[PDB]
Design a protein around this ligand. Structure first.
Ligand SMILES: COC(=O)c1ccc(CN2CCC(O)(Cn3cnc4c(-c5ccc(CN)cc5)n(C)nc4c3=O)CC2)c(Cl)c1
Ligand SMILES: COC(=O)c1ccc(CN2CCC(O)(Cn3cnc4c(-c5ccc(CN)cc5)n(C)nc4c3=O)CC2)c(Cl)c1
Lengths: 338, 335
């Protein structure tokens, strides 16, 4: 009510889910394209696209906290710990893959790659012979190492750092035999919506299963990324605006998951805590989640390219929801009300 | 502390708390070890799953897992535990074990430990008719809204209710009559499970909401004046054994339990895998509530006179060799 935004019910150990759902919902261009999916023939029992349409609809219209049971049912994560055994980016990929496939053949085909997909090069360059292997790869999200790094910039420096293949890890160069080489990645494109997960756990033998890295890790409100591009572009520099901060406090999957957002990209932040949505300060959304200098910190960041902000966050009206969809969900709600 | 914890493996809410609370019911634990579970399916048996959890809590150096248990009684959905009160889960477990103990040398352990008796009376005002009927109970739900403490809650619980107007009592001959109904406790069990009514329907909305009001409970609880008839050689004096605590507003809040397992006033906090010695004030007064939203929702009391028996020592010998061998082979196969 207060903030203009409604929250999501707490209905299980769904960990990152309500955070990710709010984050996706406020990707306005995505929300609109999801509204356009042709789901009239869909089975309301099995359709992930319809379930996301329903959730987004309620988030746009409802005054009361929105429920998500049909959604988790639709993509089959219903056990006591099914969310504990997946990272947030896997849930994102399930959701986005479903709706992307559903958009095939429609006027919004390719929305998901347009918003979230970038491209990178992986190379192996032989040092002592002349042979290089190049592999262009798409990515929808980036996992950044934080252990030993102070900020996003050092994480990106680490990401594109050259690795040496020598000694017992020499590269199989085919007819050139075993060779000393160097292996690394470079960014070719950065997408309009940039999903960064921070590596906040670590599966090491010395730590048995998984411990949470609670170290301080700084991210800026404004992130410039041109220097990590293979080739910059003067008519659109890679300047990114912080949009979402998904936060975990505690040490285990019983910890507290919340998400901070400035949904208009205007620097005015709210905290989304399941059913409770509250106005908050910039400091509480950003610095306070850097981590102890004490276990409350960010594990995922969403950035939007400056040049794409107005389009990615384009206004959404009630009229943007097609009439059939509105009547189907209204009838669901009337059937429930009886 | 000498005590091991339980793994966080889901939104099990009160389960780990209840589990520790029942494990440190030493007499219950011993009787659980004695159940004849040798022919039981290691996947179907709730009694075996309880034996296995208890054994691990007694021996393991590492946080103890609970998955075979939750499978055994089939609460495996995302919100299985959100839709049940703690006393329902306790009853599921105790019904399972009690039934398994039928026809065994420990038959009756569950009622002996947890089952008390009250009388429910209906007394007619204008005619001469009184109906007395005994009811049994394993737990008591105490109203806290507008109650200062446990004493006032018990006073509310035995308070007389008027059956008048359009809810007159249909006694048997005198016809519809104006009467008054109430309960008195006939007996109080050696182990007293008290759930506090910490949620209520709020008219201002239309959900259940959590009452975070202050509510006091004592370390020593005299309950004689709530009996129908007292016993001058054995007054109903109880000692606080467990404080099951919830902090927050919702089932995503934080569940912990405080215990003094030996009845000696040396208190520990059980937070899943973390078991930490703590002050008496942190177990007791700090969980009264008032304005964190951290407070007791369940209390376990033990009759003073029964203390040393309920908390009788349990040794490795008390676990039959067949059960030990079965669980050992179970963890051998896990390789
Ligand atoms: C046992 O109790 C705990 O210890 C504990 C419980 C919950 C949490 C919070 N949740 C952590 C996971 C989450 O999905 C964020 N997230 C996602 N991916 C990660 C990868 C990573 C890197 C590379 C690749 C290959 N391409 C795949 C994954 N690594 C190394 N760490 C993470 C990570 O934290 C969402 C929040 C934490 Cl922090 C600790
Ligand atoms: C928005 O609110 C929340 O999301 C919220 C979420 C979790 C909790 C904590 N959990 C509360 C339930 C718990 O089972 C304790 N418990 C048990 N039985 C109760 C009855 C009662 C009375 C009579 C009868 C008929 N014989 C049956 C039940 N009533 C009226 N209240 C309770 C109660 O609190 C365990 C801990 C709370 Cl406090 C609030």
């Amino acid at each position: 009510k207060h903030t203009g935004y409604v929250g999501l019910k707490n209905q299980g150990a769904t960990c990152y889910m309500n955070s990710l759902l709010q984050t996706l919902f406020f990707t306005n261009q995505l929300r609109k394209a999801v509204y356009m999916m042709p789901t009239e023939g869909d089975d309301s029992s099995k359709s992930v696209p319809l379930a996301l349409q329903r959730v987004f609809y309620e988030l746009q219209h409802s005054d009361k906290p929105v429920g998500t049971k049909k959604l988790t049912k639709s993509f089959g994560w219903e056990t006591l710990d099914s969310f504990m055994q997946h990272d947030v980016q896997e849930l994102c990929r399930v959701l986005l893959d479903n709706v992307e496939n559903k958009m095939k053949g429609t006027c919004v085909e390719g929305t998901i790659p347009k918003l979230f997909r970038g491209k990178m090069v992986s190379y192996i360059q032989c040092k002592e012979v002349d042979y290089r292997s190049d592999r262009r790869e798409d990515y929808y999200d980036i996992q950044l190492s934080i252990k030993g790094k102070k900020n996003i910039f050092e994480s990106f420096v680490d990401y594109v750092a050259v690795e040496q293949l020598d000694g017992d890890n020499k590269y199989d160069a085919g007819e050139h035999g075993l060779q000393e080489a160097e292996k690394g990645v470079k960014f070719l494109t950065l997408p309009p919506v940039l999903h960064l997960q921070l590596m906040r756990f670590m599966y090491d033998p010395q730590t048995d299963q998984n411990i949470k890295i609670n170290d301080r890790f700084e991210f800026p409100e404004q992130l410039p990324l041109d220097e990590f591009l293979q080739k910059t572009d003067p008519k659109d520099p890679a300047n990114y605006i912080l949009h979402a901060v998904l936060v975990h406090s505690g040490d285990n999957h019983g910890g507290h998951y919340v998400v901070y957002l400035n949904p208009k990209g205007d620097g005015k932040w709210c905290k989304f805590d399941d059913d409770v949505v509250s106005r908050c300060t910039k400091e509480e959304a950003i610095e306070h989640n850097y981590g102890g200098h004490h276990c409350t910190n960010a594990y995922m960041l969403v950035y939007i390219r400056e040049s794409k902000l107005s389009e990615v966050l384009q206004a959404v009206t009630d009229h943007d929801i097609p009439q059939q969809l509105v009547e189907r969900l209204q009838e669901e709600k009337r059937i429930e009300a009886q």
